[PDB]
C-alpha cells in the first residue's frame, strides 16, 4: 500500500483505490495501473521534473529503502496477477529490486523529487508507473 500526496491530490495504484478515491476521481488510466483523487488537506510531497535513471524506492515486505538503477518508462509486457490480465502496461520503468504484491505504493524517489510508485515485479523485478510526465499535479 501507499499514496503520493501532492497539493490537493492523492496518487495510488487503480487496482488498490479505495471507494472513497473513486467517489472523488480526478483522473484514472488502466493501462498505466494509476488513479489520483482529491483531498481536503495539503500533501507534502513534491514531484520529480527529470529523466533520472538512479533513486532510491520503499520496500515494505522488507521496511527497507533501497538504491536502484531503472529503465526510462516504456510499454513493457507484464504477467498476470489478481489485478490484471497479461497485458502491456504504458509508462512503466523496471529495476533489479526485491518485489511481492502488497509491495504496490511504495514511492521511488530521485534527487528532483518523487519519481513513481510500485506498481510491478517478481523474480527480482520492481516496476514502477511513473508520474514525473503529470505536469497537472503541479497545479490547480
Ligand atoms: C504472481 O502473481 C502476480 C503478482 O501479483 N506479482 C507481483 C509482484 Cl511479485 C509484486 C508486485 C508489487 C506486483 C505484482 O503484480 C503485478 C505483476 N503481475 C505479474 C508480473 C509482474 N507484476
Ligand atoms: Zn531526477
Known amino acids: 500500500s501507499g499514496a503520493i500526496y501532492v497539493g490537493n491530490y492523492r496518487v495510488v495504484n487503480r487496482h488498490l483505490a479505495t471507494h472513497n478515491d473513486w467517489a472523488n476521481l480526478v483522473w484514472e488510466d488502466s493501462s498505466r495501473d494509476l488513479l489520483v483523487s482529491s483531498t481536503t488537506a495539503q500533501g507534502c510531497d513534491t514531484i520529480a521534473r527529470c529523466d533520472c535513471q538512479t533513486g532510491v524506492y520503499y520496500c515494505s515486505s522488507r ?43 511504495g514511492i521511488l ?13 517478481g523474480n527480482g523485478l520492481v516496476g514502477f508507473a511513473d508520474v514525473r510526465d503529470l505536469l497537472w499535479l503541479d497545479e490547480e
Open 63 to 105: 521496511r527497507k529503502h533501497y538504491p536502484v538503477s531503472f529503465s526510462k518508462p516504456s510499454l513493457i509486457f507484464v504477467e498476470a496477477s489478481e489485478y490484471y490480465p497479461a497485458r502491456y502496461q504504458s509508462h512503466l520503468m523496471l529495476a533489479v529490486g526485491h518485489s511481492e504484491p502488497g509491495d504496490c505504493g
Open 109 to 121: 524517489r530521485c534527487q528532483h523529487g518523487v519519481v513513481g510508485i510500485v506498481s510491478t515485479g
